[PDB]
Every structure is written in structure tokens, then in C-alpha cells.
């Protein structure tokens, strides 16, 4: 467990020595509260005097006082301290997962990528500001009730921090025990639960074939192996108290005897024996919770470690030299070779693609290996393995990220929406640059004008996922909109067109050709209708180019053309 | 609020009793080991008895022995009766979660199905179990300590009977407050993981528009919105425990002043005095989860109304009477009406499709408007809206489910794996039907063996998780296996994808003949190679069937021929 962290925290470590402040004195209280009782008993009630119990009830009025504030300030400044790093974590993270490149994305998947973010980092500080919140309370209670019981009973204290480490012991091992069957328990625990998931997944071959009850029969099996499993576990945990209950009571019954073992240890009054034990009674939570600390704190940084893997992972290379304002390059591929991450095969091939100004060009083939990584390479979304990539003549890598990602435009139905309103998404990270009023042109221009101010605010309205929630063929409509604002030289379009609108879709044509009066475009082959007046036609099966041809030379080779 | 499930849990009752007759002990115990300090003080060290001190050891270590022994039993009983309930509540739901049609997983729900087999299940008998634990345990602790104190001291401990209440109402209040904040704040503490989500899910869309600042600007105020609401919810909630405190020392104070009274006074011992505190100081925590018990019995019955909920809506409405067993001849679609459910619009219009006998019949609808539709229809996995199918001229809705499933044959690239042995995979519902040599050898004739001994463990490996772990296209061969052993009479190949896997697909092509000896098929036109050898042909949009008649006829819409 080695912290890096400690930087992250040090900006507002005021508020952490704060809290120590406020948990001492908490223990302080306690101990002060049960030192009151040896007065009581002794100079109260054993002796018959009332000053004593006069004064008493507005002492422990006040010592919890003390003990309510200072809980409460020491939950405020733990928090203040466990939100402020924890917060400071998530935008760390936040900053560094969004600039490291996609290939990690694939590689984490989409899901794990949130819990890091929210509840893994949530108990980086929930979990590490919970062992400087028992190390302190709980072993400055420890401190101060051994202080306290040496200054009032020398001989009790003696045989208590003689036996005290038996019992330390005696919960380390034990939790020990329980920790270890319960880890490895859950590793079977795990995979009971996938067999749920696999006819509930599979409802619908389960249906087909007669498999109803010989599926029950799995379950039955399943689930009373996970049944008698949790048995197992409730069992080796539940046997966890009890012996430490009984470990202890071991040594209050070694003082105890011990009280009469020599004729002297009568002489410690009523009150003292009370205080003694009373203090026995309670150092027992402190004296687990202490060495039941570290485990917290390892768990604790685990999750920081993994969280300090995603962040220190090397992000998006960057090494870019030149600039651009609005490239009118033709993009050119010299034999380039690239795989997918993990794919021993070569996605792409030796591969060569001319693109003159304005030429609608496209990559058919329809086995999806190629024409999405073609897709998505001229982004530099995935760097190339081999090879350059040319736009202007110009080393793809040269020109600045920044610079060549807005050069690109991807529109495909796929496009995610942001959650911000009509006028900042369509302009999303250039509502500076852009007025209202070109918005509102821009929006005129792909003729989706009444498409989406028809809206319950028109350009004001939240057009994001949980909010409107724009369909899918109006979320192709304001994914090309976007894309006419920002008039760049390389279209690239996917046209995927998983959803295809009736009466709409046509305006998307008659868009996107607008989207196309200029801006060199890499638009894929798909439906006739937009590659009718494609330029130049390719075909890219398995990353191999085997014919590249206009419309007629491609109609004279086998080809797949009507669908 | 209305447990139903008392007919579940009263076969395990003695589960219940033994744990309901071993926690009172418990609670005894708890209350004897506090009463044995009366002796100490008084009979012991106030005294100089010091055989009373010495006989005192072994009652503490018996009263734990005890304690700890009753705790074992309640925990192992209230498992077994929590493990006996939980399991049962497992199978129910899986076996009427399955009779449940398709309908009901048309993602009405999707991955809460898990959730609510699994962990919301263990939510019924964790936090119903938790309400008869505590009940019983801690709610006999108050009565034991108020029969102690009623013993030991009459003129203190009607004090308490005044008292218990006003501290009751306090924690009730206090927890009443911090549940409403909490559960009003977590409702909008969700925001900043759904704004993580719209960052990390669109990482591209993203890097491409260049935004990557103004979502950094966005995630930064979110999560300062986190930061202050998890503050407020964590001062509402650390709040709650230094009012409770207050106010009960509130209680601590005035008994101890009346206690000053000199009709109190001189009536009450030491080591009377000392079990009174000592009993208040232990009525705390029961009295606190006594009163929050209704909140966790609340939950549980919840979680159990949702599990109630689930189980109690209507199965797949079966009313078959006819049955079948092979049945080959057309099948006769009548002007049948159906829609999705959640749309309106007819996904079937009037359709009329005779089935050709021996020979099969494909759809080159590619918009999907009744293609898929009608493979599920004639499972029956949907049920249908108006009209009738007929299956050789008789009624759907005549022969059983079970019946009918058993006649038809689905193969799709989505076909997943049952986590057993492939040979049982191939034989589902259907390993007693026929012996190994018909699966091994239709292996071959599904053109599969080659491949089942090139997995390295062989043919009796485990196929799902963690097994091989079959490809796509290996998934349809598999399937494909499947297929020809059931000598099924109808085969719905969906044909969803033309999967181009090189050397394999061939063999699939040859398998789908060796499965289209006979068999009216329904095979859905995807490839132009099957296509070519469609004995009828048909073409459905806007659930219609826009053409019928074979390829000739369908020459006058060739627009989509070739692909
Ligand atoms: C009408 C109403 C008016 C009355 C009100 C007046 C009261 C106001 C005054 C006080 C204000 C509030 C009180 C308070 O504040 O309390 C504590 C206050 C400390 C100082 C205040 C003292 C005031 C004195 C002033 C008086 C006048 C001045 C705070 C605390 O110290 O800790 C509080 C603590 N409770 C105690 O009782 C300690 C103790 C401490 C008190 C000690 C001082 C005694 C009083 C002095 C005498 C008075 C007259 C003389 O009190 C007791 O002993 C009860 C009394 C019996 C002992 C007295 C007799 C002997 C004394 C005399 C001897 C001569 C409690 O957890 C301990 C429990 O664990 C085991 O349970 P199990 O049963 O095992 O399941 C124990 N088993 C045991 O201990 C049994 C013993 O070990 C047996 C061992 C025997 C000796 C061992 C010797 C060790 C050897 C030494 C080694 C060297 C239980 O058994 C109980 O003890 C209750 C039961 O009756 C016990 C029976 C008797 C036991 C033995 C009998 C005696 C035998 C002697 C015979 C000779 C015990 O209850 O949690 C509270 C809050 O919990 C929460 C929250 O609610 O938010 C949730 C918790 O989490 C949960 C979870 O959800 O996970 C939920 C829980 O449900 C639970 O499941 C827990 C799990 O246990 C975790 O695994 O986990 C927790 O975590 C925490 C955390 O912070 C969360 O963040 O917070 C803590 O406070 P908090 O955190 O600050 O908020």
C-alpha cells in the first residue's frame, strides 16, 4: 500500500488534522464519561454526599455534548476532505480517460469505465478515510482508557495490557479466518448466478426446444448448492463473534479472579473495580475495530491502485506538428496495414485510396471488416500500424490531433446526443464561435428547419437523452445539422442506416447532397440511392483491395450492387 | 404490509422457532451477565465475602458460553429458514418466471431480471430475517432489562417506563428525518453518473467535434454538485446519531437527578445503581433498532411485493387442445394481424402465406416489417392480434405450446450455448431420447465433427462459459447439429446475417441443404446464394407482402436482387 494519493489530499489535510482534533477529543469524552463513574459510586453513593450528584448530571450533559459536536464536526471535516478527494479523483480521471484513445475503450468496455469513475472511486475515499477514522477515535480511546485505568487500579492495568494483546491477536486470526473463506467463497458464489442469466437470456431457445424442465432441474441443482453455500458462509462468519466474545470473557474472567488472587487487590474501591470494568466493557469495540483497520485501508487501495492504473496508462500519443484551418487535400493511403487491438489479423491490407476534391468515393464489400476500420482510421481514432496516411501530402500524424478531428465530420445513425440544448449541441464546442442566428441557418440550410423547431422550445429545448429523447431518424436529422455547421473538407459518413425513415429519410438525402455540394466525401457503399452518383467506387473484402472503379467498371465485374 | 409469503415460510417454521427460542436466551443472557454486577459491588467488593467474587468467573464464562452458543444456533437456524426461502422464492420465480412468454423479456425488463432473481431474492429473507432478529432478540433485551430493573430498584425504573417512550419517539423522528433527506437526495444524486455515462459512452462524437473542454467544464460543476449534496446527505445522516445521543442523555440525567432524591437515595446500593446505569447504557441500542425495525420489514415485504409482482402476471396463455408430432404440410397464414407489443402500427397486415410442402419459401422485405415477425409467429413466441395461422390447415392456438415448439426449428448466428456437455447441447430436452451414436454421428452429417474433435477438449467439453466457447459461425453449425437430430418439421433459419467466414461458410451452405432435404422452410432471404435456390419467393414491407411470387415475378421490384 504505497500512496501517491497523499498529494491529492494534501491541499486539504487543514481540514483531516481538523478531524483529528475533532475524534481525540471524541475519545477523550468517552473516557472523561466513564471516569465519572467512580465518583458516583464511590464518593456519591458509596458515601453519602450530594454535591456529588448535584454536579453530576450537568457533567454528563456536557461531556456529550462534547461528544455530539464533536462527531458531527468530525463527520463534516472527514467529508469535506473524503468529498474534495474524491471529487479531485473523479476529475482527474474524467480528464485523462476522455484524452486516452478509444483502443482503451474497447478494451474496458463501456460499463466498468462508469464504476471507476463513480463507485470504485466513491470507496477509494469512503474506505481510506474509514482507517483515519477508527486509527484515531478508536485508538485514542484505546490510549486514553489504558491511561485512565493505570492511573486509577496499578494492578488491573498491568494484567490488562498483559492479556490486552491475547485478545488482539485472537480477532486478528479469527477475522482472518472468516476473511479467507468468505474470498474464497465468492469466486463460487459468482458463477451459480450465471446460470439465471443464461435462461433468462435464453428464454426464447428454451421455448423452441422442449428444454422447460430439464432447465428447472439445473436450476434446482444450482440453487441448492448456493443455498448450502451461503450456509457455509453465515456459518464461518457467524462463528466469528462468538469466539471472540469468548477469547475476551476469558480475560474479564482472569481479572477478576485476579481481584482476589492476593488479599491486596480488596483494597481498589467499589468505584474503581466499576470503572475498571466498565472500561474492560468497552475497549473491546475499540480493540477490534483497530485491527480490523488495516484490512479496510487495503481495501481501500486497491481500488486506488486500480483507479491510479487507469490514470497512469500512457493516453491518446500525440506528436502532431503541423495545423490546419480547412485542408482541400485529397486523402491518400500508401499500402497501409492496420488491426484491430488484439487481432492478429490485418484488418487492413496494402491498401491505396485516391479521394479528388469532391469525389463521393466509397469501399463496398458489406462484410464489415475494412469499411468501418477505413471508417474510422482517417480520424486517427486507431493509429495505423504501417504505412501513412496523406491528407495535402501531409503525414496524418503531423497535423495537430485538434486540428485534423475538425477537419473530420462523422455523421451515421449511431451519433450519441449531449445532454446540453438544441442551439449548444448542434454547436457543441462552438457555441463561442457561432451566434443563435447562423444556428438557426444552419439549421435552414439541411432543410430539417421544421423538423426540430417544432420542438417545445424549437432551438431551446433540451434535446438530450433524458429529456426529449429525439428519435433515431430526427437523431440522424441533428447529427447531419451539426455536421453543415461546422463545414469541413473530409465527410466522413458511415451510412450504416440501421433505422431508415419512411417520408424523412428522403430529406436526408436531399441533406446530405447539400452536406456534399463541397467537402471531400468517403461516404461508404450502401443503398443505391446515394451511390447512384458516386464518383468512384472500391471494394475492400478483408482488408484487401481487389478492384477500384467507377460505377460501370464495377458493374462489370461480379460485384453486389442492387440491394 | 401483507405477507403472502407465509405459506413459503411455514414448512421451515421450526427454522424460525428454534432461532425465536435460542434469541430470548440470548437476551437472558445479555440481561443475568448485566444482573451479576449487583453482587460484585455489593456482595463483593463493598462486602468481603470474596467466595461471591470467586463463584463469579465461572457464571461470566457460562452466561457467554450461553451467548455465544445461542448466537451460533440463531444465526445457523435463521440461515437455514433465510436459506430455505430464499432458494424457494429462486425456483418459483425461475419456473414461472419461464412459463412467462416472450412478451414479458421484449425488454419490458432486461438485466433487472437478474437482479431480481438473484440479489433482490436475498433482499427478502436478509432484511425480513433482520426484522425477526432484532424483534426478537433486541425487543427482549428491553423487556428483560425492565424486569431487572423493576426487581432491583421500584422507586428508579418507573422513571424509565415514563422515559423509554420519550427517547423512543426522538429516534423515531430523528430516523424519520434522515430517511427522507436520504432518499430525496439520492434521486438527484444520480445525475453525475448519467452525465459520466453521456461522456464515456460517446468518447467519439467527442474527439471528433473537438469538445473535449466544454464536457471537462461540464463534468467539473457536476461533480461539484456531487461533492455538496453527498456533504449535505452525510451532515443530514451524521446528524442524526448526535440528536439521538443528546436527547437520550437528556434521559441519563434525569434519572441520575432523581436519583438525588433522599427517598431514592439510600434505598438504591451500589451495586443496585451500577445495573441500572449499566442497563440503560445497553437499553440504547436496543431501543434504537427496535423502533427502525418496521423500516427493514418494510424493505424486505417491498422487494417481496416486486418478486410478487413478477410471479403473480399471467403466463404464456396456453389453451392447446389438438396435438402434433411431425407434421410436414403447408402452412396456411389467414390475414393475420400483429403488432410489437408498445406499437400500434400492424407489423402484420392481412398476410396470406401457404407454406410450400417439401420446398421453401423466403422473404426479401429488408426492412424487417414482418421477416422477423413472422419466425417468431410461427413459434408462437408472440401471440397474435386477429386471423388465424394454421399449421397443415389447423389452428395455432389448437395444438400445445410445448407441441408446436417441438415441430418448429430456429437457427440464427444469435443461437447461444447451454453450459453442458455438447453432446447434451445438441440433445436438449432430448439426451434420453437418443443415445450418443445419433449425436456424434449428426455431427458429421451437420457437417460439425470435423470441428467438435478439433476443440481441444473434445466432444464431451463444456461449450458455454468458460468452455470452448464456440465463433459465430461455429455457433451456427452448432445450432445447425442441433437442427438436424430433432428431424424437425419446420426449419426457421433466419438467415439474420450472411456470415463470410472463409472455409466454413461453404459448410454451413451444404449443412442448410443436408437440413433442406425436406422441411417447409421459412429461410428469410439475406444471401444471393440461397436466394437462387428459393423454390417460392415473397417480399413484405409495411407488413404487407408487397409482392408474392417467385423470382420472376419479384424481377418487376429488382431493385434489391444482388446483394
Ligand atoms: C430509556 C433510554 C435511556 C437510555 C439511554 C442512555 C444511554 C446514553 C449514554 C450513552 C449514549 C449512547 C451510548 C453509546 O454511545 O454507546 C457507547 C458509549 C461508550 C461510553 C458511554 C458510556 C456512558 C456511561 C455514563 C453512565 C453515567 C456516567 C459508544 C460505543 O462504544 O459504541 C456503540 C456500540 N455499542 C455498545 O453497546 C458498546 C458498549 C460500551 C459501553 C461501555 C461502558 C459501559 C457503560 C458504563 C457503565 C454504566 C454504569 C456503571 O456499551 C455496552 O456495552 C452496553 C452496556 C452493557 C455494559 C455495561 C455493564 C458493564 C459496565 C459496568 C462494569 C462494571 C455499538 O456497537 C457495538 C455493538 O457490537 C456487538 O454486538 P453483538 O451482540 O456481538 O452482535 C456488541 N456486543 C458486546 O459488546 C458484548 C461484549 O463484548 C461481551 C464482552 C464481555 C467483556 C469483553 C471484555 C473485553 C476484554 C478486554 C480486552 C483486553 C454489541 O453488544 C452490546 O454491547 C450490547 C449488549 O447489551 C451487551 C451485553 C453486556 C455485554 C457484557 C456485559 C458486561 C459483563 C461484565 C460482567 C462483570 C454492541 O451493541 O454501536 C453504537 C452505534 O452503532 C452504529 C450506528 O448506529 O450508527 C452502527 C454500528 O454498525 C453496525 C453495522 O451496521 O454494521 C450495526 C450494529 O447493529 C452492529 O451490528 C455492529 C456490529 O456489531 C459490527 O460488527 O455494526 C457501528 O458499527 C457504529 C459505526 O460507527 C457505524 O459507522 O455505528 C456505538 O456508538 P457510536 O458509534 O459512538 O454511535
Redesign the interface.
Known sequence: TFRRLWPTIAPFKAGLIVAGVALILNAASDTFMLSL?KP??DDG??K?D?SV??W???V??GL??L???T??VS??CI??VS??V??TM??RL??H???MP?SF?DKQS?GT??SR??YDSEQVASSSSGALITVVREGASIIGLFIMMFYYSWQLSIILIVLAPIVSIAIRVVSKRFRNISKNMQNTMG?V????????????????????????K???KV??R??LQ??KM??AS??S???I??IA??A???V??A??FPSVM?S???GT??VV??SMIALMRPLKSLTNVNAQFQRGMAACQTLFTILDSEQEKDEGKRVIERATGDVEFRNVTFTYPGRDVPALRNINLKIPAGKTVALVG??GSGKSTIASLI?R?YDIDEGEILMDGHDLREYTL?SL??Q???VSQN??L??DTVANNIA???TEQYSREQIEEAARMAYAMDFINKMDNGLDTVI???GVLLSGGQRQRIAIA?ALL?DSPILILDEATSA?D?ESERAIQAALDELQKNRTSLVIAHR?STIEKADEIVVV??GVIVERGTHNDLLEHR?????
Chains 1, 2 share one sequence.
Open positions: 463513574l458516583l459510586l453513593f458509596g453519602t450530594r450528584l448535584v453530576m448530571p450537568l454528563v450533559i456529550m455534548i461528544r455530539g459536536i462527531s458531527y463527520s463534516y467529508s469535506w468529498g474534495k474524491v471529487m473523479r476529475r474524467f480528464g480517460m476522455m484524452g478509444v475503450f463501456t469505465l462508469l469513475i463513480t458463477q448466478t450465471t446460470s439465471a442469466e443464461q435462461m433468462l437470456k435464453g428464454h426464447k431457445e428454451v421455448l423452441i426446444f422442449g428444454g422447460q424442465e430439464v432447465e428447472t439445473r436450476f434446482d440453487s441448492n448456493m443455498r451461503g450456509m453465515v456459518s457467524s462463528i463473534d462468538p469466539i466474545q469468548l470473557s476469558l474479564l474472567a482472569f477478576l479472579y481481584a482476589s480488596d481498589l474501591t467499589a473495580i466499576t470494568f466498565s458489406r462484410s480520424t481514432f485538434a478531428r475538425n473530420v465530420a462523422l451519433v450519441h449531449f445532454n457543441y464546442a462552438r438530450g437523452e433524458n451539426r461546422r431508415l419512411t443505391l473484402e478483408d460485384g453486389v450492387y442492387a440491394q
